Amino acid sequence: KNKQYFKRYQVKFRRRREGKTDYYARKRLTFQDKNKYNTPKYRLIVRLSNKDITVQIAYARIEGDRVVCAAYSHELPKYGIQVGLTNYAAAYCTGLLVARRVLNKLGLDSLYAGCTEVTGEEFNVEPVDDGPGAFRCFLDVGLARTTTGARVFGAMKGAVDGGLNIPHSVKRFPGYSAETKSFNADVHRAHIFGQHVADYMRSLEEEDEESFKRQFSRYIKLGIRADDLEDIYKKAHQAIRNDPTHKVTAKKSSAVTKKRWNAKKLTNEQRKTKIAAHKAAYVAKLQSET
Amino acid sequence: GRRPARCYRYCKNKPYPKSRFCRGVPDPKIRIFDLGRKKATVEDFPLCVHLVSDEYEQLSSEALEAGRICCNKYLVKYCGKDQFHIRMRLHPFHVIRINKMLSCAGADRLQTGMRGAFGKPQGTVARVRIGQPIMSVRSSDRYKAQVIEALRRAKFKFPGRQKIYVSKKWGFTKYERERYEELRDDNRLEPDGCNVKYRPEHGPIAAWEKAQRDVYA
Amino acid sequence: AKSKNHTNHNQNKKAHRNGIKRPLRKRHESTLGMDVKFLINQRYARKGNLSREESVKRYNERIASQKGKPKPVTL
Amino acid sequence: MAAVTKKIKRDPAKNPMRDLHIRKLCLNICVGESGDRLTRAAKVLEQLTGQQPVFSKARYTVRSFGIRRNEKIAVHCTVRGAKAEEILERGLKVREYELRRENFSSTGNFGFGIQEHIDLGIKYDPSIGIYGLDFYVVLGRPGYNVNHRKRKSGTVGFQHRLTKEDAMKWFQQKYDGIILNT
Amino acid sequence: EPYITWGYPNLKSVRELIYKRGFVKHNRQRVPITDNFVIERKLRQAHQIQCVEDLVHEIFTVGPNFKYASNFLWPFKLNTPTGGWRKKANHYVNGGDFGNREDQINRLLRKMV
Amino acid sequence: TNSKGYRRGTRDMFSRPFRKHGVIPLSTYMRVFKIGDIVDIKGHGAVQKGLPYKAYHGKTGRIFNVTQHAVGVIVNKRVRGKILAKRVNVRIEHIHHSKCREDFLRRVKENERLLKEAKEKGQWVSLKRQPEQPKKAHFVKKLEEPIALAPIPYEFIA
RNA sequence: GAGGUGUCAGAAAAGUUACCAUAGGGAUAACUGGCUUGUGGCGGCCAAGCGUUCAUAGCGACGUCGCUUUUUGAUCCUUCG
RNA sequence: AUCUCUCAAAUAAUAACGGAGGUGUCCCAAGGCCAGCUCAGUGCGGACAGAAACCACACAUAGAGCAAAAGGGCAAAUGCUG
RNA sequence: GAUUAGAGGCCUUAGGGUCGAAACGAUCUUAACCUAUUCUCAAACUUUAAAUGGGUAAGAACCUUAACUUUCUUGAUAUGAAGAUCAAGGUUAUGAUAUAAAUGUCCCAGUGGGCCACUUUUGGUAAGCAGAACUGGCGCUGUGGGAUGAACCAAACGUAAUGUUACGUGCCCAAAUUAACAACUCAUGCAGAUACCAUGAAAGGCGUUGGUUGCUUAAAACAGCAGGACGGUGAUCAUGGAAGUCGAAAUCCGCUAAGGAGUGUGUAACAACUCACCUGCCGAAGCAACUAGCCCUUAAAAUGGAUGGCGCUUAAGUUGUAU
RNA sequence: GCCAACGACCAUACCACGCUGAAUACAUCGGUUCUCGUCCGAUCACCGAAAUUAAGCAGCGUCGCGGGCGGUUAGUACUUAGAUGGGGGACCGCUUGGGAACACCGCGUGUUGUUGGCCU
Structural element, H or E, at residue C45: helix C36-45
Q: State whether the Cα torsion F51-F56-F61-F65 is positive or negative.
A: negative
Order of strands, sheet of D133-140, starting from the edge strand that comes earlier in the sequence: D54-56, D74-79, D21-29, D133-140, D110-114
Q: For the purposes of burial, counting CB atoms within 10 Å of the CB of F73, is it exposed (0-12), middle (13-18) or buried (19 or more)?
A: buried
d(CA B37, CA B22): 38
HEC-encoded secondary structure of chain D? CCCCCCCCCCCCCCCCCCCCEEEEEEEEECCCCCCHHHHHHHHHHHHHCCCCCEEECCCCCCCCCCCCCCCCCEEEEEECCCCHHHHHHHHHHHHCCCCCCCCCCCCCCEEEEECCCCCCCCCCCCCCCCCCEEEEEEEECCCHHHHCCCCCCCCCCCCCCCCHHHHHHHHHHCCCCCCCCC
HEC-encoded secondary structure of chain F? CCCCCCCCCCCCCCCCCCCCCCCCCCCCCCCCCCCCCCEEECCCCCCCCCCCCCCCCCEEEEECCCCCCEEEEECEECCCCCCEECCCEEEHHHCCECCHHHHHHHHHHHHHHHHHHHCCCCCCCCCCCCCCCCCCCCCCCCCCCCCCCCCCCCCCCC
d(CA B58, CA F21): 42
Residue F27 distance to chain C (closest CA, Å) = 23
Give the residue from A126, A136, A176, A174 showing the smallest Cα distance to A153: A174
d(CA B99, CA E79): 65
Would the CB atoms of F30 and A26 count as touching at under 8 Å? no
d(CA B195, CA B48): 13
Peptide bond into D160 cis (omega under 30): yes
d(CA A252, CA F83): 67
Give the residue from A35, A201, A175, A38 showing the smallest Cα distance to A119: A175
Give the residue from D110, D104, D108, D56 showing the smallest Cα distance to D88: D110
d(CA B134, CA B50): 7
d(CA B125, CA B160): 16
Would the CB atoms of A286 and B205 count as touching at under 8 Å? no
CB of B157 lies under 7 Å from some atom of strand G: yes
B113 Rama class: left (phi>0) / alpha (psi -120 to 50) / beta = alpha
d(CA E54, CA E73): 14
HEC-encoded secondary structure of chain A? CCCHHHCCCCCCCCCCCCCCCCCCHHHHHCCCCCCCCCCCCCEEEEEECCCCEEEEEEEECCCCEEEEECCCCCCHHHHCCCCCCCCHHHHHHHHHHHHHHHHHHCCCCCCCCCCCCCCCCCCCCCCCCCCCCCCECEECCCCCCCCCCCCHHHHHHHHHHCCCECCCCCCCCCCCCCCCCCCCCCHHHHHHCCHHHHHHHHCCCCCCHHHHHCCCCCCCCCCCCCCCHHHHHHHHHHHHHHCCCCCCCCCCCCCCCCCCCCCCCCCHHHHHHHHHHHHHHHHHHHHCCC
A176: CB partners within 8 A, 6+ apart: A148, A170, A182, A183, A184, A187
Residue C28 distance to chain F (closest CA, Å) = 12
Largest CA distance in chain B: 82
Q: State whether the Cα torsion A23-A26-A28-A30 is positive or negative.
A: negative
A12 contacts on F by Cβ (under 8 Å): 22-23
Vertex B64: Cα angle to B62 and B66 (nearest 5): 75
Give the residue from B148, B138, B142, B144 showing the smallest Cα distance to B86: B138
For residue D53, give the amino acid letter. Answer: P
d(CA D177, CA D171): 5
Do the strands F76-77 and F84-85 form a parallel or antiparallel pair, or are they unpaired?
antiparallel
Would the CB atoms of A68 and C74 count as touching at under 8 Å? yes
Q: Which chains pack against D, by 3+ Cβ pairs within 8 A?
A: A
Q: Are B97 and B13 in contact (CB under 8 A)?
A: yes
- Dihedral (C-alpha) F89, F50, F32, F58: value to the nearest 10 degrees? -80
Contact B205/A at CB under 8 A? yes
Q: On the CB side of A64, how many CA atoms lie within 13 Å of its CA?
A: 3
B200: CB partners within 8 A, 6+ apart: B187, B188, B190, B207, B208, B211
F31 contacts on A by Cβ (under 8 Å): 62
Give the residue from A133, A163, A137 showing the smallest Cα distance to A240: A163
Nearest to A106 among C35, C38, C72 (CB): C72
Q: Are B187 and B200 in contact (CB under 8 A)?
A: yes
Nearest to F29 among A13, A27, A38 (CB): A27
Contact C75/A at CB under 8 A? yes
d(CA F65, CA A167): 30
Resolution (A): 4.9
Evaluate whether chains C and F are touching (3 or more beta carbon pairs less than 8 Å apart): yes
Residue D154 distance to chain A (closest CA, Å) = 8
Chain Cα centroid distance, residue E61: 14
B212: CB partners within 8 A, 6+ apart: A282, A283, A286, B187
D2: CB partners within 8 A, 6+ apart: A274, A278
A264: CB partners within 8 A, 6+ apart: none
Q: On the CB side of C40, how many CA atoms lie within 13 Å of its CA?
A: 2
Q: Which residue gives the smallest C-alpha to C1' distance to J114?
A: A66
Q: What is the DSSP string of chain B?
A: ----GGGGSB--S------SS-----------SEEE-TT--TTT--EEE-----SSBEEESHHHHHHHHHHHHHHHHHS-SSS-EEEE-----EE--B------TTTS--S-SSS----B---EEEE--TT---EEEEE-GGGHHHHHHHHHHHHTTS-S-----B--BSTTSSSBHHHHHHHHSSSSEEE-SS-EEE-TT-S-SHHHHHHHHHHH-
- β-sheet bridge partners, residue B125: B60, B94
d(CA E28, CA C45): 53
User: What are the backbone angles phi and psi of residue D28, rounded to the nearest 5°?
Assistant: -130, 130
d(CA A145, CA C17): 69
d(CA A190, CA A86): 16
- Dihedral (C-alpha) A77, A79, A81, A87: value to the nearest 10 degrees? -110
Q: What's the N-to-C CA distance of chain F in angstroms?
A: 51
d(CA F50, CA F95): 12
Q: Which residue of A has its CA nearest to F28?
A: A62
For residues B84-96, b (16+ Cβ closer than 10 Å) or e, as one string?
A: bbbbbebebebbb
Q: Are B148 and B45 in contact (CB under 8 A)?
A: no
Q: Are F94 and F60 in contact (CB under 8 A)?
A: no
F22 contacts on A by Cβ (under 8 Å): 10, 12
Structural element, H or E, at residue E20: helix E11-21
Peptide bond into D113 cis (omega under 30): no
Give the residue from B217, B214, B213, B187 showing the smallest Cα distance to B200: B187
- β-sheet bridge partners, residue F71: F90
Q: Are B24 and B123 in contact (CB under 8 A)?
A: no
d(CA D6, CA B17): 63
Residue A286 distance to chain B (closest CA, Å) = 7
Q: Which residue gives the smallest C-alpha to C1' distance to H44?
A: D105
Give the residue from D21, D1, D3, D15 showing the smallest Cα distance to D143: D21
Q: Which long-range contacts (CB under 8 A, 24 or more apart) does F142-148 make?
A: none
Q: Are F90 and F41 in contact (CB under 8 A)?
A: yes
Would the CB atoms of A34 and F30 count as touching at under 8 Å? no
HEC-encoded secondary structure of E32-44? CCCCCHHHHCCCC
A219: CB partners within 8 A, 6+ apart: A83, A201, A212, A225
**Separation in Å, CA F72 to CA A133, F34, F44, F66:** 32, 12, 17, 7
What single-letter DSSP state applies at residue C20? Answer: -
Give the residue from D138, D131, D121, D111 showing the smallest Cα distance to D42: D131
A40: CB partners within 8 A, 6+ apart: A59, A60, A61
**Separation in Å, CA D105 to CA A213, C55, D101, D166, E11:** 40, 88, 10, 11, 99
For residue D100, give the amino acid letter. Answer: R
What single-letter DSSP state applies at residue C65? Answer: G
Give the residue from A222, A177, A172, A229 showing the smallest Cα distance to A198: A229
d(CA B123, CA B121): 6
What single-letter DSSP state applies at residue E52? Answer: H
State whether residue C61 is helix, strand or coil: helix
d(CA D110, CA D102): 8
Would the CB atoms of B217 and A286 count as touching at under 8 Å? yes
Q: Are A44 and A138 in contact (CB under 8 A)?
A: yes
What single-letter DSSP state applies at residue C5? Answer: -
- Dihedral (C-alpha) A224, A229, A234, A237: value to the nearest 10 degrees? 70
Chain Cα centroid distance, residue C20: 25
Chain Cα centroid distance, residue A7: 39
Would the CB atoms of A144 and D151 count as touching at under 8 Å? yes
d(CA F74, CA F85): 6
For residue A74, give the amino acid letter. Answer: H
Q: State whether the Cα torsion C41-C46-C47-C53 is positive or negative.
A: positive
Nearest to A143 among D2, D150, D154 (CB): D150
Give the residue from B194, B171, B192, B170 showing the smallest Cα distance to B182: B170
Give the residue from E91, E84, E48 showing the smallest Cα distance to E66: E48
Q: Are F31 and A33 in contact (CB under 8 A)?
A: no
For residue A109, give the amino acid letter. Answer: D
d(CA A155, CA A168): 13
What single-letter DSSP state applies at residue E18? Answer: H
Interatomic CA–C1' length for residue B83 and nucleotide I34, angstroms: 32
- β-sheet bridge partners, residue B94: B125
Give the residue from A132, A133, A127 showing the smallest Cα distance to A167: A127
Structural element, H or E, at residue E53: helix E52-57
What single-letter DSSP state applies at residue C54? Answer: S
- Dihedral (C-alpha) A105, A108, A110, A114: value to the nearest 10 degrees? -100
